[PDB]
Every structure is written in C-alpha cells, then in structure tokens.
Design an enzyme around this catalytic site. Structure first.
Site, PDB file in Angstrom:
ATOM      1  N   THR A 205      20.675  52.362  10.704  1.00 31.88           N
ATOM      2  CA  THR A 205      21.373  52.711   9.987  1.00 31.88           C
ATOM      3  C   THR A 205      22.751  52.264   9.597  1.00 31.88           C
ATOM      4  O   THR A 205      23.268  51.051   9.701  1.00 31.88           O
ATOM      5  CB  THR A 205      20.626  54.201   8.994  1.00 31.88           C
ATOM      6  OG1 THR A 205      21.386  55.051   9.459  1.00 31.88           O
ATOM      7  CG2 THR A 205      19.582  53.851   9.006  1.00 31.88           C
ATOM      8  N   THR A 206      23.754  53.236   9.987  1.00 31.99           N
ATOM      9  CA  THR A 206      24.789  53.600   9.569  1.00 31.99           C
ATOM     10  C   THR A 206      25.160  52.058  10.651  1.00 31.99           C
ATOM     11  O   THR A 206      26.471  51.528  10.470  1.00 31.99           O
ATOM     12  CB  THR A 206      25.537  54.367  10.559  1.00 31.99           C
ATOM     13  OG1 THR A 206      25.417  55.643   9.422  1.00 31.99           O
ATOM     14  CG2 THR A 206      27.387  54.290  10.542  1.00 31.99           C
TER      15      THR A 206
ATOM     16  N   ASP B 171      12.830  61.117  10.992  1.00 32.21           N
ATOM     17  CA  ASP B 171      13.889  60.429  11.853  1.00 32.21           C
ATOM     18  C   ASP B 171      13.341  60.770  13.971  1.00 32.21           C
ATOM     19  O   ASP B 171      12.682  59.895  14.497  1.00 32.21           O
ATOM     20  CB  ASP B 171      15.212  60.471  12.511  1.00 32.21           C
ATOM     21  CG  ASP B 171      15.836  59.840  11.081  1.00 32.21           C
ATOM     22  OD1 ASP B 171      15.259  58.827  10.288  1.00 32.21           O
ATOM     23  OD2 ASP B 171      17.121  59.718  10.385  1.00 32.21           O
TER      24      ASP B 171
ATOM     25  N   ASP C  73      22.421  59.608   6.647  1.00 30.40           N
ATOM     26  CA  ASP C  73      21.676  58.420   6.872  1.00 30.40           C
ATOM     27  C   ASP C  73      22.143  57.737   6.001  1.00 30.40           C
ATOM     28  O   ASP C  73      22.079  57.702   4.459  1.00 30.40           O
ATOM     29  CB  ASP C  73      20.460  59.258   7.087  1.00 30.40           C
ATOM     30  CG  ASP C  73      19.831  60.249   7.533  1.00 30.40           C
ATOM     31  OD1 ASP C  73      19.959  60.137   8.843  1.00 30.40           O
ATOM     32  OD2 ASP C  73      19.359  60.835   7.520  1.00 30.40           O
TER      33      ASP C  73
END
Lengths: 31, 526, 535, 523
Positions: B94-95, B391, B61
């Site tokens: 995120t990424t 998540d 993550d």
C-alpha cells in the site's frame, strides 16, 4: 485540622494561567 | 486572445499540452504521495480524516487513506487506482507502492523538462522493471520442513511482521497466535468468508477471544423471551425458514363463509395450522430453533412450555455460518424434518460481554468457520483493531500456500539497486541515465523507514551502501538499536509476492503519467 | 503552492482544497493534549465526597441537575474529534463496570498533561506511548497484591452494605445513606444467580412517582403496573389472588384472514344474534371453571364483558402492556395463555394481597403486591419532592446496584480513599529506575499522573495538595505500607480499614487499562483533515 | 409616569428601578477596586479600544477609576469622590471608594426594612459625628526630638509604599521618599523633586541625585567642563528680537544701506552678549532658543550656553541655584549669580545629561528611576509621587493615627456604644454605619487570604476591653500592637476618608427619581 479554609472563586482563577500561555506563545516563536 | 473564430469548434474546452503539462502531472503525483509518507514502518503515525457526515476515521493503511482524500486531478488519481488493485492482490503493498511509484517520476522529473522524449523513458522503465523482478526470484528463500513446527514458526513470524505499523505494541504474540490457528480451521479453499470478526465494546485488547463456533447478537424479541433458560449442555440446532406467526397468509386468498358452522371452523383452523407446524418441529430434540423469519408470541409460549429455546430474525449471513459451524443443514419446510438435518454443539449460553447479550455456540468438532470477538474501549479503537486482523489473516493465508519469502525492511530494495547498477555500468549510451534513475528510486523505502523515526538517516543509509556492496545483502534498519541489523537472522520475513507485485504496479503507474502529452477537460459540468 | 503553479496555471489536487486545513508538526500533538485539558478541567470538579453538581440544559429547554458523569458528558455539544473520544472512554467504563465515570477522564487527562513535557524534551511521540505501557504493567501487577474480602453473599453482608455506602456517599441521597444502601443489597441478592455469579438486569425494575420524600423509597417484593379496573364498581381488594394472564380480547373470536360473512335470510340474521350472545357467556365461564378470581389482559374488553365480570365476581384490568404481562407471569409463577378455550388451573398465577394505591389528589392507581411465592423479580419504588431528585435517585441506586453486581462477578476488593492510587504511584517510582535506559522520563511521568486523583480529591476536600500528599506518601514508606488515604473531615485518622472505604478490584483494573489505551490512540496522530465551510 | 408620557425623547425612572439601578451601579465601583486594598492585593491592567491603546498597569484606585468611563449617572457620584481624595492628600483612594460602597450596600438593606430614607440619612449623620470624635481623641502628636520625628516619616513612607509595586525594595525607595522631602525645607511644591525614567537595571538600582540634571547638551563650540562655575539663568531673546516697533520697514534708495544696516543688526547682538558676559559667568541657561550668531560669541568667550532646557526649567534652576530669572540685563551689579562645583556631563542609561553637582542652596533634587520595562517605570514613578505627596503634608501636620484597622475599629466602637443609647428607629441606621466601618479590616484580611472570621472577632474583642492600639498583623495573620510594629497613617488622610464617604453616600440616598434627557449625536 486544616487550620482554616478560603474559597477562591473569581475572575483571576483563569487570568493567572492565561497570561502565562500568551507569553509562551511568543517565547517559542524565536526558539 | 488567440482562439477567436467567428464559429467555435467545440464549446469552451480547456486544453493543455507539452512540458508544463507533464511537469504538472508529475507534480500532482508528488503531492498526493504526501498523504502516506509518514505512515511507513513500525514507527509510522496514524491519520484522522473527517467525512461529510461528521464521523472521523483513524487509520494508517494506504488503502483507507487514499480513498478519502477527494482527489480530482486526473493524474493524481493514477496513484489511487493502483492501490485498489494492490489491496486485493497483496495487502502490505500500500504505502510502499504509492511512495515508490511517485519516486519513479521524481527521479526523471529534472530530465523530462529538457528533451528526453518519453518514448525512451518508457522502454527503459520496462527493461529495469524486468531486471528487478527477476532478481527477487533468484534470492527468495524457501523451506523444506512442511507439516512441522518449522512451518508453524514461519507462519507466526509472517503474522507478527504483518501486524507491524498498526495500533499494536505488545499484543503481537496475542493476536498473531490466534490468526495462524484460526486460518488452520478452514478447508482447503481457505475462503476468507469463513472467518468473521465482530466488535463488542468493553475490555482491553488482551480480553478478545477466538470462538470456534458462531454467535448472534439477540435481535428484536417479543414478550415471553425473558423465559426459556439459557443453559444447555448438549443441544441440537434446527435452522428453519418457516413462519411461526398466526397471521401468516398467502396474500391472495379470501375465505368466503356462508354459515356459523364454518365461521368457527376457520377461526379454529387458523390456530390449528400454526400448532401443526409447531408440533412437527417438536419430537426432534432441536432444543435450539433459529430462523431468519419472525417467531410470534404463540410459538414463543409453545416452546417455553416444551422446555425449548427459539430466536427468530437471524440474518442469513450468520445462519449460513451456523450451518457450517454446527455441521447440519438449513431446511425450509417443516414437513420433512428429521434428526439427520439438525446441528449439534456442546455449550449454548447467553453471556453479557460488554453489557450486551450475545448467544454463543461452541463445542462442535466439525466447525468449518470461526468468529473472532474484539474487545476495546472505543468504536474507533476496535475498528482499527479489526483492520489489523484482516491484514494478518491475508498474509498468513498466502504464506501457507506460498513459502517463498524475502528479507523485510529495505534490505531487498538495496540489493535490487545494486543489481541494476551492475547492469547499467555495462550498457553504453542514454540508458545509463534511465536505468540508474529507476534504481535510485528504490532507496525511498530504507530512507522513509528512517526519516519517520530518525535513526541518523544520512549515515545509516551510507552503511547499507557500504555493507551490501561488500558482504551480505540481508542488512536493514533496526528499530531498537539505531543502526544496521541482519533481517534474515532476525527472521524479519515478508512474502516474496509483496515486492514482485509492488514493482509491477509502480512501473505501470509511471508509464501512465509519462506517456501523456495532452489533457482535454470538457466544460459541461453541472 | 496550491491553485498556482510555476507556469501561472491553476494547481488543483483535491476537491475544494482552498477550504481545507492541515497542520502536522508537533502542533497536532499539542492541540490534542490542550483540548484534553479543557475536558479534564470539567470532570475534576465533581470528584470526591464534596463533588459539585452540574446543571444540563437540553436542546428542547428541559433541565436536569445531575452528578453522574455519564449524564454530564453525554449531553455535550463539543465539535472536536478527540474530545468526543474522551466521552467514549467514560462510556466504556460505564458499560463494563459502572463506577468510574469521573475517574477515567481525570486519569487519562493527567497522562496527556504529563506527556506534554516529554514531547518538549525531544522524545519520539510513539516512544512516549510505549513507555506508558511499561509503567502501567507495574501499577497493575501491584494493584492485585493488596486485596481481601470476607463477603460470602449469604448472611454476612456487612462489607456489601459498606460498599454500597461508599458508592452512594458521593451522590445527593446521603439523607438515605443507610436506607438506600440496604435497598440496593436486598434488591440484588434476592434475584442474583449464585450458581453462575450472574445478575439479570431485567429482574430489577425501577419505578417512581413525584411526591413525598426520599425516605419513603421502598423495595416491593413484586410488580407495579398501572391499574385500571374495567368496571368502576369492581372491588379493589383481593386477599388471595389466582391470576389468569390472557393475551386475547374479550370479544367474539374473529379470523385473521379476509372473512366477509354472507347473510341472506332472516333466519341467518337472527341466528347470528343468538350465537354471538353465547360466545360472550362462554368466554367468561371458561375463566371461572379454573378457580381464577383475577384476570389480567393485554387487550381491552367489550361492554358485554364488563357486566359478566361483575356478575361472576371476577375483577380484571385492561390494556396491560407487553413487558408488564411478561413480568407478571414470571413473578407469579404462571404462564401466558393464548386463548380462552386453552385456560387451565395449572397456568394460573399465585399471589397474595392485590391493592391499588391512590396518591394525593391524582388518579395514578399504582399496583402493590404484598406476598409472593419464590419470586425472582423485585421492584423499587422511588419517591421525591421534585422531578430532579427522583431522576438523580434513579442513577444513585443504579450505581449502588452495579457495584453489588461487580462484587458478585468478582469478590476481590481494594482500599479506596486514594490509598490504591498513591501506593501504585510509589511502586512505579521504585521500579522506574530499574532500568533508566531510554524510558526513565516516561515511566516517572506515569507515576506522577497517578497522583492526579488524591490531589484533585484534596483540592475538593479543602486541603493543600502539597501538605497532604507529602505526609501520606512519607507515612506509607516509613512504616509497612498501611491502607492510608485522605478525607475531608479526617474522621479521626485516615486509616481506610477503619473508615470502611471499599472499592472493587476489577473496577480499578479497567480504569487503568481503558485510560491507557485511549491515550495511546490519540497520541499516535499527527494529521487532522477536518472540512471547513460548505462554500 | 409610563402612562400618559408627555416627553419628546426623554425617559424617567421612579421609586422602582431608580434606586435599584443606582445602588447596583455605584456599589459595583467598590468591588472593582476592592482587590487593591491592603499590602497583599493584586494589580490591574487597563486596556483601551485601540488607536495606540497605551496599556496601563496600576494599583491605585484613582488611576483605575478615572480611566474606566463610567456611564451610569449615579455611579459617577463615587468616581468624582475618588478624584477629590487623590487631589487633596494623594492616598487612601481605595479605602474611601470601598467604604462609600459598603455604606450604600447597607442602605439598600435598610430600605428593604421599610426605613424612611431620611431616617437612614439622619442616623448616618449622628454616626459620622461619633466617628469623628474617635479620630480626634486617638491622634498621635509629634513635635520636637527629631530622632523620633524622622522615624514617623519613615513609618508613613513605608506604609504607603507597601501597597504598591515597590514592595521588596523598601530599603531603597523609603529613603528616596523621606530624605527627598526633608532636603527641600520649604513649600510643598511637589515639583522640586523631579523623576527621570530610564530603562536598564532593576528597581533597586535607582538612586538620588544630590544635584540637578539638565537636558539639551552643552552646545557646539563651548567648553564641556568648568570647575567652580558661576551660573547665570536667563529668560530673554537671543535673536530675531524685533525691538517693540510693530509695522516698521527698511525703505532705502540702494542695497548699500541694507548691508550697512545688517552690520548694525549684528553689532547690537554683539553688544547684548557683551552686556551679559560682563557679569563674570561660566554657565548660561536661557529659556529661548540660541541661534548660530550668539552661539559663536558665547563659545569665543569660553562660556557655555544651554537653550530651552524646559519651559519651567529656568524657574526650577532659580530655586536650586539661588539666583533670579533675569529676563533683562541692564544693571549687572543688581543680578545675583549661582555657584556649583562641576558642570560635567554624565552617562545615565546611554543618555548624556548635564550634571550640576555641589550646587549651593540646592533646595531641589532629582530621582533617577531605573526599571526593566516601561510598565515598571510608570507604576514605580506613581509610587514615588504618592509617597512624596503624603510626606509633604505630614511634615506640616504631624498628627497620625494607628493603622492596620486600628482606627477603623476605634471609630466603629464609638458609633456602636452611642448607637445603643438611641431609640431603635435610628439606632438601626447608626449600627449600619459601624458595620460598614468594620468592613475595611475585613476586606484587607480577605484580599490577603487570612481567616477574617477570626481576625475581625479578635480585633473587636481586643478593642472592647482597652487595647486601643490593637490591629491586623498582615505578616503572621494575627492581631498585634500597631505602636510596636510601627504601622501608622496620616491623620488628614484618615479624616478625609471618613468625611468624604459619608458626604458622598448621602447623595445617592436622597434621590428617588432619575430623569434622563434625550441623547444627542447617536444614530
């Protein structure tokens, strides 16, 4: 019966494999 | 050799200015992005990072990777701070957000070296950002089948998608079903503090369990707690903040005795006060007595002879959840106990899951909380599992209240680049080189979703360009067949807010970098 | 480049970047598999009835020789983040089942070793990890097909003793091959709860004293504590014990709060002297009024009490610890009494002969209880000629107790000796070709890895693994698959039904599941960020 | 000794560690090369510390031990023994090394029994004499009937080679060894059989050159091929002759005389070459270098000339061409010429060599050794050298003994039967001698991986009741007849192994005190 038994406990136990690994390191270098 | 006055202006300060400083700032952003480039998509890899304590963390993550990189460059930190926000606001963002924000700068990097003052770039970034965000709102889909199996299926599909890019392969149907149902146990605040996750070593992923009630880990006990059998079929629970030790004092009293008659009376009084409290706790039915405070040896034997169970030193976090799980209240003084403050459940047992003792409550129909017990073969194995549950719960919680979803994968990003290209081809002048640069960066998502696992990246991206320009815009990259698949029909859906916030954060990140011309670093560092 | 930009300026991204190391490629994956080979090469040497022992030398110079993989792997100084996980694998198996402390490392290593060729064939690292799941399900489903037991945990304990013999046969206590097998069965069945199939680990205590021989290990239906009678001339034998368990010192009661007694007159000074004398007499008579004839006290005694204990023929011991008085009260059916004035006959414990044992020239004075009334706790007393065999005997009996508990939890068993592993490898191979879409190479690799166990067993047994494996695998196909395994002395034939080599079903189910999960979490890594030197 | 030391920088060991460290250090030599004994042994690689490390792969114990660098003053005793065995016969260097080590191991055990070291030595002297008779009475002779003699040479060559790299190439290199020696029909110089090492091809591709190969290709302006050539070899000066007057100068009134003398200088060189050419020659080999001027004269004459083929090359050519060194040419009618069929150049391993084919009285040959690697070439060359050294002596002393442990059991039998006729004070030492002799067939079986527990018992049981030809069958792992299998060894090789191990071993037993001088050049 197993028809005999031989205990192999000496330095070659590791060399017989170490020499092969060293050769692989170069063999893949030019792959 | 130039700044050599007889008296210095400041002290020893480093200062850079101009084109090499902007290129350096963009370059720093490109390098830090490398930490997550291989973490995107169902076939991403995990990273192993070792801290100064010698302990490794294994994760994929972005909200855990970027915080451990020890970034010092003033510009590279920009792509980390925006992750701190997206961790709250979105979760999945995120990424994808880090990679897109870095690409926004790469697309203009070859131009900012030769004129093209950032004042015109920033304005173009704002125009393109507003265009892209409006386009999402015009294409997102909703449902009109609330409080039906159709909404349950929507939430389940959201959970199974959320569990992608985790250490999960065939357990999606196992975890996803419990995540959706666990959240439906909550009140209409859906407050995440009501869902606990606890790790118990031993067993496989499929051996985990969702407990409607609560459990505590049986902390430090005294001699006498081998007694008190652990078999109850209808206990009541007293949650008390009362001290049950003989050595309880007010810490400010001195008992001055002048005769033997009072000597013995004080010795007896200290024992009688303790027993008075214990007798008031009794005659209540509270066969289970729990407290955050110590329960001493005398009380332990009292409860044993009364056929009662107790356990002290329970943390406040679990007592508050226990109150909400058992439907009762927490009372500080024992002088006003009654049947109207006690909790109730059906089963109370001490189990041996993983070898360690755990005291589980279950059977309360009015349980406003729940606990999910993780089982696994290692500390890091369960730690990664816990992250996947946080998540999935976050995505489901949001999907319940906001049913506006978009196609997953790169399907939306391709359509956004299509809309922007249609816009740019109607605008004269320098904007053509700036709106297009924004649009081109949007392909980093379907590209990386292929580069990390092959799929013939060059040609499969060409297929997306050919399809979206002529037909539907829900086409993305499959994992099973190395070709294009329709994400809409496959129900590969993500909340619309994931991309809306990703566009906003990525745009602002670019404007923070290109708007800087000078960096000043004070020399005083000790 | 780092620390040098195209403009000649330094380029600094992260703190102390010049002291970091990163290498991704396929080299992270090969490094992880290679490091695992170093781990597997260690544990393979202690597998099977001929398994060789390890000598572990602790940081303080202490030395212990053990066979138990839990004691070998827990004492390692390996500074490698993945090799440390291999130890956690053995820990999870030890905590849940308690048997396969060697097996899960050898199996997991084989999965990593066989995976090496799969990466060189160009198979995506993650597709390899997923392929193992498709093959593992096949082995697990067939593992539950062949299973049977006649154990009822009442009187027909023959297969239960045999299970203990199978487990203990790998340990250094075969001089007590039968004796310790029977002790372990009797220890558990006398405390186990047949209603829930639960066994409370606190109801079996394991004690020991250096000296004698392993054959002198006994199961005592009672408790053993350090006996130290407060009065040296007190008789050391009680034939019929009425035991008072007390948690109050034999001294005049004092308040817990600040007291500071004010004494002014001589009448006050002298009057207190009398009152205190009476307190010493009352606290002892309050015991005799209950019929008690043995007191066991958590606290010590005053000098005044020891004389009164003599004159009232009331033996007692001193400074008995927390868990000791807890166990004594339970074992004897009594209750712990807070004070002297709360003593009553209804809370007294009941026991038979109470004696202390002197050992050679030492002063250990250990308790033995001969008779008890429906006790739910037992004590094992281990002897031995040196400190090392006793500590290893503790682990040897521990394993025997654990596999008994496992049969109580689940009474389904399988045939050992490699029969289960070879049969699973054959089953996976048969389905590996149904259907060879992408995973043909991965599923076959799993089947080959399953054979690492009968092959390592054959090597340690002195047999050629090709001559042994080719015969057994053929015999299990030419005829309806018998429980055909391997052994060193062959014992006639290798029919596991006649050799009575019994292993637990739930044990192997966990070994396959835990080994597979551990392999997955260390294959799906391609970047290690470990710091180097401090400066 | 350690109390009241009166030494400058020296030390000493007495009666406590002197013998202990001597036995440990020396016996270790046997264990080093122990693995090389027998047909199934493994080979060693020896490495240097650096500075052109010159890696060596080898099997033979002599080449191993002579490159170790043994520092222990007692272990050096056995190292020198193995040198002598290599110099004398060139085979059995492993057997004598391990035999001496086993004798010393037994001596340490006998000291532990409180047997005086002079009693142990005395017992070994009597046991050694018993073993010597066992070899004398068991020797096999070969005289006439050449169809049987040649077979003996094939057996000796096969036995030696079976222990070296040239294992599964016996059908090529056995003939290269036996026939190369038989073609010499003369002194065992061991230099008349030259080996040329080339990379390319396999070991099986080696062959014997019927003629003689030279280096230093055929000139510049000279014929490259002449049929039915007459060969003249020489050891004379081609130029800068500086005829025998030391301290002579040319001192003239003008440079005209210098030019005239320069012409005279060349006229005498012209005459010199003409005096050689009057011999009627086609090929000229001179040890000393050929300068530009005689090279033109030989070319114009249609005669080839080779310069500096080698220092000893001319001597070797004399033996294979049937001529004479001819360092001076002043009576052509007294100078003998050689003759050959072809002088053509041949291409061997991408290198042109001068091939003298069909040479009369060719008492010499060259072996062309081919291999894949340099380590293969060097070890294969040594294998040829070892076999040729033994064969050059077998053709001089035809006595052989039966191998495969047969001779060793016969020697151990004689020692045992006589030891049992002696009083215990000495019999315990004679028995230890026989026990060491039986270690050799034990080591051979143990290196191959055979159950030596049964091969030794069966071999001893066989020799206890006749069966004086019984020995180890290293192919099947049983006991067989050495005469039928054809496993024989040279008598002289076996004699020296027995005598050398006994003589060297006594050196260690006699020492109770080692005094070590202060070292020099160590800071």
């Amino acid at each position: 019966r197993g028809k005999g038994a031989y205990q192999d406990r000496d330095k070659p136990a590791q060399i017989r494999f170490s020499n092969i690994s060293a050769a692989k390191a170069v063999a893949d270098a030019i792959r | 050799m130039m700044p050599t006055p007889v008296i210095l202006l400041k002290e020893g300060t480093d200062s850079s200015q101009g084109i090499p400083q902007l290129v350096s700032n963009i370059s720093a952003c490109q390098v830090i992005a490398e930490a997550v480039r291989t973490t995107l998509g169902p076939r991403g890899m995990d990273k192993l990072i070792v801290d100064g304590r010698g302990k490794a963390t294994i994760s994929n993550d972005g909200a855990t990777i970027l915080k451990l990189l020890d970034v010092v460059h003033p510009a590279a930190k920009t792509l980390v701070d925006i992750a701190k926000s997206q961790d709250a606001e979105v979760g999945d963002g995120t990424t994808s957000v880090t990679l897109l924000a870095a690409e926004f700068l790469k697309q203009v990097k070859p131009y900012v070296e030769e004129g093209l003052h950032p004042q015109i770039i920033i304005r173009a970034f704002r125009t393109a950002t507003q265009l892209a965000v409006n386009k999402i709102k015009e294409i997102a889909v909703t449902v009109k089948k609330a409080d039906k199996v159709e909404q349950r299926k929507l939430l389940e599909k959201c959970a199974m998608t959320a569990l992608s890019s985790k250490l999960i392969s065939q357990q999606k149907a196992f975890f996803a079903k419990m995540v959706v149902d666990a959240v439906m146990m909550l009140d209409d605040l859906l407050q995440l503090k009501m869902i606990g996750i606890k790790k118990v070593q031993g067993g496989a992923l499929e051996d985990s369990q969702l407990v409607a009630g609560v459990a505590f880990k049986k902390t430090f006990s005294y001699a006498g707690f081998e007694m008190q059998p652990k078999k109850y079929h209808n206990p009541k629970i007293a949650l008390l903040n009362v001290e049950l030790e003989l050595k309880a004092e007010k810490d400010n009293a001195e008992i001055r005795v002048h005769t033997v008659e009072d000597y013995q009376a004080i010795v007896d009084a200290e024992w009688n006060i303790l027993y008075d409290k214990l007798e008031k706790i009794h005659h209540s039915g509270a066969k289970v007595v729990s407290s955050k405070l110590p329960i001493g040896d005398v009380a332990t034997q009292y409860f044993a002879d009364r056929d009662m169970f107790c356990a002290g030193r329970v943390p406040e976090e679990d007592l508050k959840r226990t109150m909400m799980a058992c439907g009762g209240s927490i009372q500080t003084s024992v002088n006003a106990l009654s049947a109207d403050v006690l909790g109730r459940c059906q089963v109370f047992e001490e189990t041996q899951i993983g070898g360690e003792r755990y005291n589980f409550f279950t059977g309360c129909p009015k349980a406003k909380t729940c606990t999910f017990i993780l089982r696994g073969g290692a500390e890091q194995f369960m730690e990664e599992t816990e992250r996947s549950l946080h998540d999935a719960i976050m995505i489901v919680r949001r999907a319940i209240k906001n049913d506006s979803v978009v196609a997953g994968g790169g399907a939306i990003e391709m359509e956004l680049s299509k809309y922007l290209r249609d816009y740019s081809r109607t605008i004269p002048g320098k904007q053509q080189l700036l709106i297009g640069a924004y649009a081109k960066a949007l392909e980093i998502i379907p590209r990386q979703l292929c580069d990390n696992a092959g799929f013939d990246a060059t040609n499969i991206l060409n297929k997306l360009r050919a399809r979206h320009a002529q037909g539907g815009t829900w086409y993305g990259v499959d994992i099973n067949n190395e070709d294009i698949a329709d994400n809409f029909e496959a129900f590969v859906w993500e909340p619309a807010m994931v991309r809306i916030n990703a566009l906003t954060a990525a745009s602002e990140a670019a404007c923070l970098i290109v708007s800087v011309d000078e960096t000043i670093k004070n020399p005083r560092s000790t | 480049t780092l620390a040098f930009d195209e403009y000649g300026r330094p380029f600094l991204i992260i703190k102390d970047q010049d002291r970091k190391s990163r290498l991704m490629g396929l080299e992270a994956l090969k490094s992880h598999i290679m490091a695992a080979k170093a781990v597997a090469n260690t544990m393979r040497t202690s597998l099977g009835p001929n398994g060789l022992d390890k000598m572990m030398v602790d940081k303080d110079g202490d030395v212990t020789v053990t066979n138990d993989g839990a004691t070998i792997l827990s004492m390692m100084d390996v500074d490698h983040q993945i090799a440390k996980l291999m130890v956690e694998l053995s820990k999870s198996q030890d905590d849940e089942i308690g048997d396969g402390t060697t097996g899960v490392v050898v199996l997991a290593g084989a999965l990593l070793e066989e995976a090496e060729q799969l990466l060189d064939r160009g198979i995506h690292p993650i597709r390899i990890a997923d392929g193992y799941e498709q093959a593992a399900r096949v082995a697990i489903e067939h593992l539950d097909k062949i299973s049977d037991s006649v154990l009822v945990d009442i009187k027909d304990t023959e297969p239960l003793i045999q299970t203990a013999k199978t487990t203990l046969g790998s340990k250094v206590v075969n001089s007590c091959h039968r004796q310790m097998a029977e002790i372990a069965v009797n220890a558990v069945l006398t405390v186990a709860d047949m209603e829930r199939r639960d066994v409370d680990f606190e109801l079996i205590k394991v004690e020991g004293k250096v000296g004698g021989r392993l054959e002198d290990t006994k199961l005592i239906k009672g408790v053993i504590v350090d006996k130290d009678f407060s009065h040296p001339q007190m008789p050391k034998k009680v034939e019929d014990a009425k035991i008072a368990i007390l948690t109050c010192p034999f001294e005049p009661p004092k308040p817990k709060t600040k007291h500071k007694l004010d004494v002014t007159s001589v009448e006050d000074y002298k009057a207190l002297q009398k009152y205190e004398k009476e307190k010493f007499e009352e606290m002892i008579q309050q015991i005799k009024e209950t019929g008690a004839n043995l007191a066991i006290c958590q606290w010590g005694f005053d000098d005044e009490a020891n004389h009164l204990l003599l004159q009232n023929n009331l033996p007692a011991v001193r400074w008995v610890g927390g868990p000791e008085i807890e166990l004594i009260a339970i074992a004897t059916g009594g209750r712990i009494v807070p004070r002297f004035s709360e003593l009553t006959a209804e809370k007294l414990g009941f026991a038979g002969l109470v004696q202390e044992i002197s050992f050679g020239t030492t002063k250990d004075k250990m308790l033995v209880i001969e008779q008890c009334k429906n006790s739910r706790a037992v004590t094992i007393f281990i002897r031995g000629g040196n400190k090392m065999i006793i500590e290893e005997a503790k682990r040897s009996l521990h394993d025997a107790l654990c596999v008994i508990r496992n049969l109580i939890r689940d009474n389904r068993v399988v045939y050992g000796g490699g029969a289960a592993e070879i049969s699973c490898a054959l089953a996976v191979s048969q389905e590996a070709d149904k259907c060879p879409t992408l995973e043909q190479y991965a599923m076959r690799a799993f089947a080959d890895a399953l054979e690492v166990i009968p092959m390592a067993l054959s090597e340690n047994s002195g047999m050629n693994p090709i001559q042994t494996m080719t015969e057994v695998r053929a015999r299990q196909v030419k005829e309806m698959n018998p429980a055909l395994g391997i052994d060193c002395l062959h014992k006639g034939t290798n029919d596991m039904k006649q050799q009575h080599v019994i292993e637990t079903l739930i044990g192997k189910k966990q070994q396959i599941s835990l080994a597979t999960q551990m392999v997955r979490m260390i294959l799906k890594i391609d970047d290690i960020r470990k710091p180097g030197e401090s400066e | 000794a350690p109390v009241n030391i009166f030494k400058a920088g020296a030390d000493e060991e007495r009666a406590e560690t002197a013998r202990l460290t001597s036995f440990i250090g020396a016996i270790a030599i046997g264990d080093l090369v122990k693995s090389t004994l027998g047909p199934k042994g493994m080979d060693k690689i020896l490495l240097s510390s650096g500075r052109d490390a010159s890696l060596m792969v080898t099997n033979d114990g002599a080449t191993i031990l002579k490159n170790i660098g043994v520092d222990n003053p007692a272990a050096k005793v056995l190292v020198d023994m193995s040198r002598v065995q290599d110099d004398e016969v060139g085979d059995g260097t492993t057997s004598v090394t391990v035999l001496a080590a086993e004798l010393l191991r037994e001596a340490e055990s006998l000291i532990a029994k409180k047997i005086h070291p002079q009693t142990i030595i005395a017992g070994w002297r009597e046991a050694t004499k018993a073993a010597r008779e066992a070899l004398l009475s068991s020797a096999v002779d070969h005289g006439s009937d050449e169809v049987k003699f040649r077979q003996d040479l094939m057996n000796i060559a096969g036995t030696t080679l079976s222990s070296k790299l040239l294992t599964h190439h016996k059908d090529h290199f056995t003939k290269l060894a036996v026939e190369a020696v038989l073609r010499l029909k003369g002194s065992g110089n061991l230099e008349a059989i030259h080996i040329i090492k080339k990379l390319g091809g396999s070991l099986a591709d080696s062959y014997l050159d019927e003629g003689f190969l030279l280096d230093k290709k055929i000139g510049v302006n000279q014929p490259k091929r002449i049929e039915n050539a007459k060969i003249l070899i020489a050891n004379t000066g081609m130029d800068t002759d500086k005829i025998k007057i030391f301290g002579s100068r040319v001192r003239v009134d003008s440079t005209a005389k210098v030019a005239e003398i320069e012409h005279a200088e060349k006229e005498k060189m012209k005459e010199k070459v003409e005096r050689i050419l009057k011999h009627g020659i086609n090929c000229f080999i001179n040890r000393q270098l050929i300068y530009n001027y005689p090279e033109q004269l030989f070319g114009a004459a249609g005669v080839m000339a080779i310069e500096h083929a080698d220092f000893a090359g001319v001597e070797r050519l004399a033996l294979v061409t049937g001529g004479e060194i001819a360092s001076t040419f002043d009576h052509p009618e007294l100078v003998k010429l050689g003759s050959c069929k072809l002088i053509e150049e041949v291409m061997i391993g991408e290198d042109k060599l001068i091939h003298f084919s069909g040479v009369a009285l060719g008492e010499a040959c060259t072996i062309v050794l081919r291999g894949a690697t340099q380590q293969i070439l060097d070890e294969a060359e040594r294998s040829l050298h070892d076999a040729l050294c033994v064969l050059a002596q077998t053709v001089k002393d035809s006595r052989t003994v039966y191998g495969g442990g047969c001779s060793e059991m016969l020697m151990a039998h004689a020692v045992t039967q006589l030891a049992n006729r002696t009083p215990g004070k000495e019999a315990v030492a004679m028995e230890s001698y026989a026990k060491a002799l039986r270690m050799l067939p034990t080591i051979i079986a143990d290196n191959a991986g055979y159950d030596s527990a049964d091969l030794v018992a069966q071999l001893r049981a066989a020799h206890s009741e006749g069966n004086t030809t019984a020995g180890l069958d290293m192919r099947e792992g049983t006991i067989g007849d050495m005469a039928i299998l054809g496993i024989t060894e040279s008598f002289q090789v076996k004699r020296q192994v027995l005598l050398s191990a006994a003589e060297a071993a006594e050196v260690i037993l006699r020492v109770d005190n080692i005094i070590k001088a202060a070292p020099r050049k160590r800071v």
